[PDB]
Structure 1
Amino acid sequence: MALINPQFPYAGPVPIPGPAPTETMPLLNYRVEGRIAGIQQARQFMPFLQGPHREVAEQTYYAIGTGIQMGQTFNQPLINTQEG
């Protein structure tokens, strides 16, 4: 967006020496076929386990029984003959 100087104008570009025209043109680089080499193993001996863990520990229980329940020799009360 330059302003044209009317007192000192200039013309378009003139030819100048050039950079040997084939040396600015590249070759198209020619890929050969390739292979991810080797026979891959199916599994890996991992350093960490792959499953979930638990944040807190919960107390577990198992039921037990008591035993054969016996009789008893109670201390027996007195007879309510109007004193009680």
Structure 2
Amino acid sequence: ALINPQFPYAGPVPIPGPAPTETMPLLNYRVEGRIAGIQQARQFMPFLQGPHRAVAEQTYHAIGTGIQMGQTFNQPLINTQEG
């Protein structure tokens, strides 16, 4: 702010002001609020809580069976070298 003498800035907005209204009042709000609809315990989703496999491992079962059977052919006898 600058004040300049001799033209000085009025020393106030004075008493000639026009009170325009008495509408100043905010009427307090008084209220009762009830949000009470029956609630049912459940919601349907496509899927909740699953941690789906991105790849599975290979998996398997097992079997064996049979017996011990055989047809054989042997090497001929040979002269013994030494000993």
The two structures share one fold, judged by TM-score above 0.5: yes
Which structure 2 segments of 5+ residues have no match?
Answer: none
Gaps of 5+ in 1: none
- Measured after TM superposition, the shift of residue 38 of structure 1 is 1.2
| Whole-angstrom distance in 1 between the partners of 2:5 and 2:62 | 109
What TM-score, normalized by structure 2, do the two folds share? 0.63
How many angstroms does 1:6 deviate by?
A: 1.2
Percent identity over paired residues = 98
User: Please, what TM-score do these two structures have when normalized by structure 1?
Assistant: 0.63
Select the structure with the greater relative contact order (CA < 8 A; seq sep ≥ 6).
2
User: Which moves more between the two structures, 35-44 or 72-81?
Assistant: 72-81
Deviations 1:29-77 (A, max 9, x none): 4242222231111111112232111222210122221322223323444
RMSD across aligned positions (CA): 3.5
Secondary structure of 1:10's counterpart equals coil
Distance 1:74 1:36 in 2: 95
Higher helix share: 1
Deviations 1:2-52 (A, max 9, x none): 121012102233446777676442334424222223111111111223211
- Rounded to whole Å, the distance in 1 between the matches of 2:2 and 2:69 is 120
